[PDB]
Each structure stands twice: as structure tokens, then as C-alpha cells.
Design a binder for this molecule. Sequence first.
Ligand SMILES: OC[C@H]1O[C@H](O[C@H]2O[C@H](CO)[C@@H](O[C@H]3O[C@H](CO)[C@@H](O[C@H]4O[C@H](CO)[C@@H](O[C@H]5O[C@H](CO)[C@@H](O)[C@H](O)[C@H]5O)[C@H](O)[C@H]4O)[C@H](O)[C@H]3O)[C@H](O)[C@H]2O)[C@H](O)[C@@H](O)[C@@H]1O
Length: 554
Amino acid sequence: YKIDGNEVIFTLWAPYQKSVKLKVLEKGLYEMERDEKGYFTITLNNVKVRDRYKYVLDDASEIPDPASRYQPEGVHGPSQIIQESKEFNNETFLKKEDLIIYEIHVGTFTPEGTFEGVIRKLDYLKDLGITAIEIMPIAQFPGKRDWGYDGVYLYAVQNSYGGPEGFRKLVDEAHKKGLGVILDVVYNHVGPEGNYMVKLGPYFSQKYKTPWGLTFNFDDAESDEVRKFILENVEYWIKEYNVDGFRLDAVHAIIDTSPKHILEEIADVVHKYNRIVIAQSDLNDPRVVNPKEKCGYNIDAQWVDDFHHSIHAYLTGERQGYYTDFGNLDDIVKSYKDVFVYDGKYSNFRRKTHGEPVGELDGCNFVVYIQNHDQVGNRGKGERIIKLVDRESYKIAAALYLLSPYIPMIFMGEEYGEENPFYFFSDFSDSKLIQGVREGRKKENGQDTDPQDESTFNASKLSWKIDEEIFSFYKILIKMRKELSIACDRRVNVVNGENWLIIKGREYFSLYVFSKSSIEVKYSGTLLLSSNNSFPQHIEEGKYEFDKGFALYK
Ligand SMILES: OC[C@H]1O[C@H](O[C@H]2O[C@H](CO)[C@@H](O[C@H]3O[C@H](CO)[C@@H](O[C@H]4O[C@H](CO)[C@@H](O[C@H]5O[C@H](CO)[C@@H](O)[C@H](O)[C@H]5O)[C@H](O)[C@H]4O)[C@H](O)[C@H]3O)[C@H](O)[C@H]2O)[C@H](O)[C@@H](O)[C@@H]1O
């Protein structure tokens, strides 16, 4: 819908439909006029915020507005008219070279499980050194318990998180504290419950499908309208909620053979309104991130799993699934200097040559992490890395990524040493999908906890039990990164022995000692931070026997 003067225009694209009627609940039924493209319209003057409505098809069946702005009674309920105050800055104050990102799942972040709960934690975040919070998908999904990827109304803010009013309040309060908010958005697929688009028109591609459902139709018959549906959604989040940027989910599963890729158009919209796009890419292909004059889509940055996988595989000893492609120290050094480990070499996991070198692109085109919702939650027992490595290793892992040239992303709780698992949970009502989720998560991930069980969700809620030694470590790590101008700068010299490595930057050098060993140090410097007490306040060029641990020098 779109509120005009005192009247409001209802627009519904439904080419499969002969005639649709608007059903305002406390008022009457209204016949909609049809144009040749398949668009249904009526201007109504009696409608006010916040009335409920549905659409009634040729079927006589009643469905919610697929472009709904609020879904008060969940996915199968009516839609609701909200206020459309388009207050937005023309500029985000976020500078992407200064980006430290904190990933939040609203539902489990705090006892509240709401936007109000993340608001309460803003000062804490600000004080930690974070510059931006990344919110997992908030587009309305079934029930109350879901990561967000089963979202099924792109324009509707999850009711159980606190809806539109609560999200607007979150972003306003974040700006007041000087924090940015990045929104996780899903344009590659749609959730398996509460989607009614398939009855309206060819929203989905017949060409291929994702592991999580059918993909959107971007390059085939009638795709103009669906391109518009997605592109106006990124416009909507910017103008109606004043969001600072986006994390685009699974861009490798957004397939488009058009002259201009939809991903380039997505980035075009966000840069038109001076915002930021990060992409989750499995492609290891610099085209996602390259400038337009270099045949790229010009996304600001992309997740580099290769960085995480190098660290995890090496420190845990783990080789199951995608970890089989990693495990050596070499991999960490490779990722530290060439970004991708798979830059056009053969992957045993994928059984094909994978990737492409990244060129002279600086570090702030990439985001790295040792933990996130996937690397924790797709484990059958959902164990955080804190459970798989010793204390020393954990701090070594934290130092590696936070002191890297790339944009670092902290996973909620990681910073204070959270020990609670993060499980996969869902809240479907359809018995077939309740059947499929359990058996699928059992088979694919080895998950023994029931995703549909409430306890699986409750067990994933952060404890907020502060380990002060870990927290102080992160706090200083973040501080020193800013102070040492580590951001974006790929000019690093890395040396490695069997059980250790030294990384030297322009203003610092770091010692990463994985086992007691004798190391030749080529640099002088004063101690900034350390995982131990075993490290000297002042070090000079020479040979030293170090115990397991990390040290940072100026
Ligand atoms: O191949 C090497 C890489 O492998 C991984 O990456 C892939 O999988 C990731 C995790 O699934 C993807 O990440 C993102 O995309 C998905 C989907 O949006 C999302 O996945 C989560 O949510 C879905 C949807 O609920 C869930 O799907 C299952 O359950 C539903 C409900 O029953 C069912 O319909 C599906 O059939 C089930 O499969 C997933 O289980 C859950 O993981 C994820 O959260 C997003 O971040 C990547 O895009 C994709 O490449 C690995 O993550 C990489 O690190 C490896 O490099």
C-alpha cells in the first residue's frame, strides 16, 4: 500500500488471478481494477492506520498482502496499515574502514528476546568498541522461534520481536549512541510456510532452486515485477527505518542471466542513498566486490569463510564437511596475505577448481570472523569455538581476526566468553514441515536436539555470564586495532615456523605461538597486549623461547 492525502492506494500484482477483492475487516469488500500487466488497484478514502486487511482471490480464499508492512498475527494472519513517516538521513555516518561488526539474533540476545532488549544493551556494545550491529533477518517468519531465514514477508517486521515500532526505536536509539545498524536481508529464497506468492504470479524461478526452497524469478517471463519487488524492499528499509546498510544472504544463490545483474542493481540502490552492502558469497569471486569498471557488482564487502575455516580447522583439528579443504598453518598465512585460500585451485570438498585471485583490493572489501550464526549453529551440538580449543587458542583466534586487515565481525557473546550452545530452532505449525525439519537437521547436521522444541531455543539464549579476562582482552584488541591503523591495510609481512607465526604490519607486530617454541624475532617494540604474563614489556631483535600464547607490540 501507499498512503496519499487522506486516501490510500492498494496495489497487488497477481497475473495468475482473474479478479481480486480487497477485504478490509471492519469495513466491506472492494473490487479491484485490473491492468494488462496483472496489477490490481483501488484508491480508498475510508481507510486509516491501523486497519487490518486481506485479499480474496478467484478461489474465494483469503490471503495476506505479500508486500505487508506488518503481520500482527503471524504469517497466516491479516495485514495491517502502519505509519509511513519517511524520515531518513541522506547519509550514514558509518565509515566502512572503521567498521567493527557485532552479529545479533534478537530472539536469543537478551532474556527479553525483543528490540527493546537489544536497546538495553546498546551502552555495553558502544563501550566494547563496536561501530555497527548486524541484525539477523527480521522479515516476518512463522511463530516466535527462528534464525530469520524462514522469513516470508520481506516488508514486515517480526511481530514477536516488537514489530515496526520497536525496530524504528532500535535504529533511532543506536544512532543516538553513535552505533550503526546493518540489516540481514534474504533475496535468494523464501520460507516454506506462510508464503502465498506462488498463487499470485511467477515470483519464483522454475529454472533452479536453492537447498532452502525455490529462488526468485529475475531473468525470465514476467521478472520485471519481481526485480521491482526486491529493489523496492531495499529502498523501503532505508527510507522507512533509516537502516545504515545490508548483509545480503547467500548471493551465490541469486542467479541472473540479465544484461545487468540484480546484485549490481541492489548495490546501485544502496549507494544512491549513501549506504553500505556486505554480501555473503560462497563464490570466492572478486566480481561481487569489484568496481563496475572492472566488471563487478560493486558490493562494498563480502564474507570470507576461508579466513574462519583456516583458523578453525587448524586449531580444532577438525576435518568434517567443508573443513576437509583446510587444516594447515599455510592456509591461515595464505588467507592473511591473499584473502582467499581457494583462489582458483582444486577443492576436494567441492570436487572442482574453485575461486579466483582477488587482486590489489584493500582489506575493507572483506569481512572476517571466528564465530557466527552459521559456524556455531550448523554444528549438530551447536558448540561455540570456546568448547573446541583451550583458553590460549581462543585468545589467539580472537587476536588473529581482530588484528587482520579485514572488517572483523564478533558473534554475540564471543567477546565475554559465552559457553552456551547456539542451536538451529524453528517454530512451524504445519505438521509436514515439523516432520521435515527434525529429520533434515538430524541427517544433514547431526542435530539431536529438536529444532521445534522450545528448550532448544531457550538453551541458545546468551547467559551474560561475564568472563572478565576474555572481555578485557577483546576490549583492548578492538582499541589497539583502531590505534594502530590496522584497518584495510594489506601490506603485512608474515613469517611462520612449525608451531608459530609472526605477523608484522606498518605500526605493529604480533606473535602467535601455538606451542612452546624458539622464535627469531626481527623487530623491536613495546608491549600493547598479551594473552599471558610471560611476554616482556620491551622486546628486541633476537632469539626467544616462548610458551603458547599471543603478544602484540608497537
Ligand atoms: O559449501 C561450503 C560452505 O557451506 C556452507 O554454506 C552454505 O550454507 C549456509 C548455511 O545454510 C548458507 O548460509 C546462509 O543461507 C542459509 C539459507 O538462507 C541459512 O541457512 C539456515 O537457515 C535455513 C532455513 O531455515 C536452514 O535450512 C534448513 O531448514 C529448513 C527448515 O526446515 C528447511 O526448509 C531446509 O531444507 C533446511 O536445509 C539451514 O539449515 C540453516 O543453516 C544460513 O543461516 C545463512 O547464513 C550459505 O549461503 C551456503 O553457502 C557454510 O556455511 C560455509 O561456511 C561453507 O564455506
